[PDB]
Amino acid sequence: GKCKDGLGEYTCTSLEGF
Amino acid sequence: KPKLLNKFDKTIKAELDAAEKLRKRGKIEEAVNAFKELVRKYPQSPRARYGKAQCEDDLAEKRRSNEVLRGAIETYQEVASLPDVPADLLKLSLKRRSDRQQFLGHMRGSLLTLQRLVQLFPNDTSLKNDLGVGYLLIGDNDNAKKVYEEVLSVTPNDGFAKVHYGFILKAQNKIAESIPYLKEGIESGDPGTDDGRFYFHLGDAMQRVGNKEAYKWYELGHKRGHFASVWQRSLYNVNGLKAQPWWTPKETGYTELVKSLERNWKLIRDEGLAVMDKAKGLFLPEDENLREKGDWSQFTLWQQGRRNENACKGAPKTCTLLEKFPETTGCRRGQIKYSIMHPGTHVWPHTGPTNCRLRMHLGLVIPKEGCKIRCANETKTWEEGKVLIFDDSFEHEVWQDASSFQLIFIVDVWHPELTPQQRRSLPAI
Numbered sequence A: 001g002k003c004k005d006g007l008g009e010y011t012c013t014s015l016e017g018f
Numbered sequence B: 001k002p003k004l005l006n007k008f009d010k011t012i013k014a015e016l017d018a019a020e021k022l023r024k025r026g027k028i029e030e031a032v033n034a035f036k037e038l039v040r041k042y043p044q045s046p047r048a049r050y051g052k053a054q055c056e057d058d059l060a061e062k063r064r065s066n067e068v069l070r071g072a073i074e075t076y077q078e079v080a081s082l083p084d085v086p087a088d089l090l091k092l093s094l095k096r097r098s099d100r101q102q103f104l105g106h107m108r109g110s111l112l113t114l115q116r117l118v119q120l121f122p123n124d125t126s127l128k129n130d131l132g133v134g135y136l137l138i139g140d141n142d143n144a145k146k147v148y149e150e151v152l153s154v155t156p157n158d159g160f161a162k163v164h165y166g167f168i169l170k171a172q173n174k175i176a177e178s179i180p181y182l183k184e185g186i187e188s189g190d191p192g193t194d195d196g197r198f199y200f201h202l203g204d205a206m207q208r209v210g211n212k213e214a215y216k217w218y219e220l221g222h223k224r225g226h227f228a229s230v231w232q233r234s235l236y237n238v239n240g241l242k243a244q245p246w247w248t249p250k251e252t253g254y255t256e257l258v259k260s261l262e263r264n265w266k267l268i269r270d271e272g273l274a275v276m277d278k279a280k281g282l283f284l285p286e287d288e289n290l291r292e293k294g295d296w297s298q299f300t301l302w303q304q305g306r307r308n309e310n311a312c313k314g315a316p317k318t319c320t321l322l323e324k325f326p327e328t329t330g331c332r333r334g335q336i337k338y339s340i341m342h343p344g345t346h347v348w349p350h351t352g353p354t355n356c357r358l359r360m361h362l363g364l365v366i367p368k369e370g371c372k373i374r375c376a377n378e379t380k381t382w383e384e385g386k387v388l389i390f391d392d393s394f395e396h397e398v399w400q401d402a403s404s405f406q407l408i409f410i411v412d413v414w415h416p417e418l419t420p421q422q423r424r425s426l427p428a429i
Ligand SMILES: O=C(O)CCCCCC(=O)C(=O)O
Pocket: B276, B280, B281, B283, B284, B295, B297, B340
């Protein structure tokens, strides 16, 4: 689930370490 | 305070302390060698193994190396496999393992580690709360909900559990049910509850049910540093970017993009209508619970700065036109998409996730009456062949009360004050 128009997800970014 | 040394480790405390002194003095390379020697000489020592893992963790920070960190993640697990590990040390090691797995994006891995922690420490409520976050981070809201229900049935006034339970209910459109959990949770002041996500969604649940207390919570969220203002409530921000709800083309500096959209708007319209007529299932229903009522669907050409090749088969000339403009095609915090909205639609007041984009709307089919958009305190209408520009990190709201469909083209651009460095480095949204 991506935050496209809103802010509904617990996190909107992906985690990729450093 | 923590008891990290088992019976044998207490007998080698001088060697263990000497190695840890090296790590605390920032001599990370010497410290990894010291703990590697202790692991060689004392392979069952939990404290030696934890020291090696901590040094590898520090080294990964120093080198900014994911590979070094994967080594640390494995050593933290090794700690837990050794005999006689003191409870405090086992909990510290696996907790840091999970934390580092999340940092790397290993969310399934972190989930297994958290499940193991809850099995090993069945009375530790904070570990169940952490497991709930694990589920939320992978999008498993059903399992997260079961976890916070279990926590609340033992400790009903745990504020961390309440705000997360409230967040889940709200995401499920159980709006009225979510309000007391979000409100009581924030009011607990428990660690982890002072979070802009919970202020954001409590205020929004309040707005949806008509509770005028909403803006008091927005005001408090602003006072606590979570929101740039009570109007602009995005949570993925770059501080200091110019903040205003409505923009002119000249203010944005993207006058060449705007001229191209307005000169060429009929081709963009005609490709959208052809999809409407011949390929309407390319329009996907809005899926972020932003509607009170009505029908609204979007057909996306770019998202996160990435062209959808199959979608651009359906609007090839529009995609060809837009590819001249990396200020939008490379906007990894925005989209390029057609949007169709039908009569009887009301979109709740809402905010997008980031102040790093501005949102252009090109009017394509605009009924002469019945369509309007509010951003902050100011309401506007669209025109066919004309671009409107607003900052959708400000609260905005739309009504469609015409007698026929409305079609617009949405083009997100990087906020103009963002440097090229930032446009390269910001995580995609
Ligand atoms: O509303 C539109 O024309 C775009 C989305 C169409 C999706 C297909 C469908 O079920 C319908 O005809 O509503």
